[PDB]
Design a protein around this motif. Structure first.
Motif, PDB file in Angstrom:
ATOM      1  N   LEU A  55       0.849  -1.172   0.000  1.00 40.33           N
ATOM      2  CA  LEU A  55       0.000   0.000   0.000  1.00 40.33           C
ATOM      3  C   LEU A  55       0.892   1.230   0.000  1.00 40.33           C
ATOM      4  CD1 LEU A  55      -2.596  -0.893   2.819  1.00 40.33           C
ATOM      5  CD2 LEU A  55      -2.648  -1.553   0.384  1.00 40.33           C
ATOM      6  N   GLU A  56       0.368   2.319  -0.539  1.00 37.51           N
ATOM      7  CA  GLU A  56       1.090   3.572  -0.461  1.00 37.51           C
ATOM      8  C   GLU A  56       0.126   4.652   0.005  1.00 37.51           C
ATOM      9  OE1 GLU A  56       3.139   6.850  -3.336  1.00 37.51           O
ATOM     10  OE2 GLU A  56       3.473   4.720  -3.879  1.00 37.51           O
ATOM     11  N   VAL A  57       0.602   5.503   0.913  1.00 36.60           N
ATOM     12  CA  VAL A  57      -0.186   6.610   1.424  1.00 36.60           C
ATOM     13  C   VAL A  57       0.561   7.891   1.088  1.00 36.60           C
ATOM     14  CG1 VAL A  57      -1.016   7.720   3.569  1.00 36.60           C
ATOM     15  CG2 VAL A  57      -1.183   5.217   3.288  1.00 36.60           C
ATOM     16  N   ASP A  58      -0.054   8.738   0.256  1.00 37.91           N
ATOM     17  CA  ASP A  58       0.470  10.068   0.018  1.00 37.91           C
ATOM     18  C   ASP A  58       0.062  10.979   1.174  1.00 37.91           C
ATOM     19  OD1 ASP A  58       0.633  12.903  -0.780  1.00 37.91           O
ATOM     20  OD2 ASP A  58       1.463  12.008  -2.597  1.00 37.91           O
ATOM     21  N   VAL A  59       1.060  11.478   1.912  1.00 33.82           N
ATOM     22  CA  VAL A  59       0.794  12.198   3.152  1.00 33.82           C
ATOM     23  C   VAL A  59       0.195  13.577   2.841  1.00 33.82           C
ATOM     24  CG1 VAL A  59       2.591  10.901   4.417  1.00 33.82           C
ATOM     25  CG2 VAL A  59       3.144  13.159   3.544  1.00 33.82           C
ATOM     26  N   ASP A  60       0.559  14.166   1.701  1.00 32.54           N
ATOM     27  CA  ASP A  60      -0.029  15.426   1.277  1.00 32.54           C
ATOM     28  C   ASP A  60      -1.523  15.243   0.985  1.00 32.54           C
ATOM     29  OD1 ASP A  60       2.595  16.770   1.384  1.00 32.54           O
ATOM     30  OD2 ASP A  60       3.022  15.681  -0.504  1.00 32.54           O
ATOM     31  N   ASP A  61      -1.918  14.102   0.411  1.00 32.16           N
ATOM     32  CA  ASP A  61      -3.307  13.879   0.014  1.00 32.16           C
ATOM     33  C   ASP A  61      -4.096  13.184   1.123  1.00 32.16           C
ATOM     34  OD1 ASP A  61      -2.793  14.971  -2.571  1.00 32.16           O
ATOM     35  OD2 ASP A  61      -2.065  13.003  -3.240  1.00 32.16           O
ATOM     36  N   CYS A  62      -3.404  12.603   2.098  1.00 35.05           N
ATOM     37  CA  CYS A  62      -4.036  11.714   3.035  1.00 35.05           C
ATOM     38  C   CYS A  62      -3.573  12.063   4.453  1.00 35.05           C
ATOM     39  CB  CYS A  62      -3.697  10.310   2.563  1.00 35.05           C
ATOM     40  SG  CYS A  62      -4.961   9.105   2.990  1.00 35.05           S
ATOM     41  N   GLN A  63      -3.813  13.329   4.828  1.00 32.41           N
ATOM     42  CA  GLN A  63      -3.217  13.927   6.012  1.00 32.41           C
ATOM     43  C   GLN A  63      -3.764  13.285   7.279  1.00 32.41           C
ATOM     44  OE1 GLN A  63      -2.562  18.159   3.674  1.00 32.41           O
ATOM     45  NE2 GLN A  63      -3.288  18.178   5.788  1.00 32.41           N
ATOM     46  N   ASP A  64      -5.022  12.841   7.248  1.00 34.79           N
ATOM     47  CA  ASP A  64      -5.649  12.235   8.412  1.00 34.79           C
ATOM     48  C   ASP A  64      -4.953  10.928   8.790  1.00 34.79           C
ATOM     49  OD1 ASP A  64      -6.675  11.363   5.923  1.00 34.79           O
ATOM     50  OD2 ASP A  64      -8.731  11.122   6.689  1.00 34.79           O
ATOM     51  N   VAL A  65      -4.621  10.112   7.776  1.00 37.57           N
ATOM     52  CA  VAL A  65      -4.026   8.810   8.030  1.00 37.57           C
ATOM     53  C   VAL A  65      -2.591   9.026   8.490  1.00 37.57           C
ATOM     54  CG1 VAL A  65      -3.244   6.612   7.018  1.00 37.57           C
ATOM     55  CG2 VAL A  65      -5.511   7.486   6.437  1.00 37.57           C
ATOM     56  N   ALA A  66      -1.913  10.031   7.905  1.00 35.85           N
ATOM     57  CA  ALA A  66      -0.555  10.386   8.294  1.00 35.85           C
ATOM     58  C   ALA A  66      -0.492  10.731   9.783  1.00 35.85           C
ATOM     59  CB  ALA A  66      -0.067  11.541   7.454  1.00 35.85           C
ATOM     60  N   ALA A  67      -1.426  11.589  10.224  1.00 41.64           N
ATOM     61  CA  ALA A  67      -1.577  11.935  11.628  1.00 41.64           C
ATOM     62  C   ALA A  67      -1.862  10.690  12.464  1.00 41.64           C
ATOM     63  CB  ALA A  67      -2.678  12.964  11.787  1.00 41.64           C
ATOM     64  N   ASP A  68      -2.855   9.891  12.076  1.00 38.81           N
ATOM     65  CA  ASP A  68      -3.231   8.743  12.890  1.00 38.81           C
ATOM     66  C   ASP A  68      -2.057   7.777  13.024  1.00 38.81           C
ATOM     67  OD1 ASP A  68      -5.792   9.884  12.918  1.00 38.81           O
ATOM     68  OD2 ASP A  68      -6.662   8.326  11.588  1.00 38.81           O
ATOM     69  N   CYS A  69      -1.185   7.738  11.999  1.00 32.93           N
ATOM     70  CA  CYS A  69      -0.104   6.769  11.978  1.00 32.93           C
ATOM     71  C   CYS A  69       1.208   7.366  12.482  1.00 32.93           C
ATOM     72  CB  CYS A  69       0.058   6.153  10.590  1.00 32.93           C
ATOM     73  SG  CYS A  69      -1.335   5.091  10.124  1.00 32.93           S
ATOM     74  N   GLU A  70       1.140   8.601  12.999  1.00 34.30           N
ATOM     75  CA  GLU A  70       2.227   9.278  13.698  1.00 34.30           C
ATOM     76  C   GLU A  70       3.471   9.414  12.825  1.00 34.30           C
ATOM     77  OE1 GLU A  70       1.460   7.134  17.804  1.00 34.30           O
ATOM     78  OE2 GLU A  70       2.125   9.200  18.154  1.00 34.30           O
ATOM     79  N   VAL A  71       3.247   9.787  11.560  1.00 32.96           N
ATOM     80  CA  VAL A  71       4.328   9.984  10.619  1.00 32.96           C
ATOM     81  C   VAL A  71       4.978  11.345  10.889  1.00 32.96           C
ATOM     82  CG1 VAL A  71       4.910  10.121   8.152  1.00 32.96           C
ATOM     83  CG2 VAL A  71       3.114   8.560   8.908  1.00 32.96           C
ATOM     84  N   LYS A  72       6.305  11.376  10.858  1.00 32.62           N
ATOM     85  CA  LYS A  72       7.017  12.649  10.920  1.00 32.62           C
ATOM     86  C   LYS A  72       8.142  12.764   9.879  1.00 32.62           C
ATOM     87  CE  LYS A  72       7.372  10.407  14.323  1.00 32.62           C
ATOM     88  NZ  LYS A  72       6.574  10.621  15.554  1.00 32.62           N
TER      89      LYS A  72
END
Length: 105
Positions: A55-72
């Motif tokens: 799977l790939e998550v674009d953090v710019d397009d998918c900010q909620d999942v980025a937050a939930d997954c504690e990406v920095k």
């Protein structure tokens, strides 16, 4: 062949639907250099392991999942097996990526 995740709901459907297959998640951004570096490799792994979900998550397009997954930092790779996060690291590290797949595929 990599599934591009575009919402939280989609992220959650993908995890359920993987059953007990390893899920590898690349949290990425198009502008980010280490993301560009590893992307060909990540796609190629997708071909190599048909038993593993990519799977790939674009953090710019998918900010909620980025937050939930504690990406920095990007790329960040998270590893799920039975909805559990069994691993995580950041950086375009091909050895670690393949080490973790080896451990849980």
């Amino acid at each position: 062949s990599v599934k591009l995740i575009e919402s939280k709901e989609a992220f959650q459907e993908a995890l359920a639907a993987a059953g007990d297959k390893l899920v590898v998640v690349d949290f990425s951004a198009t502008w980010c250099g280490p993301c560009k570096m590893i992307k060909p490799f990540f796609h190629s792994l997708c071909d190599k392991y048909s038993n593993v979900v990519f799977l790939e998550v674009d953090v710019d397009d998918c900010q909620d999942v980025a937050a939930d997954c504690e990406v920095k930092c990007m790329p960040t790779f998270q590893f799920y097996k039975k909805g559990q996060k069994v691993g995580e690291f950041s950086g375009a590290n091909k050895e670690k990526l393949e080490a973790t797949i080896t451990e849980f595929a």
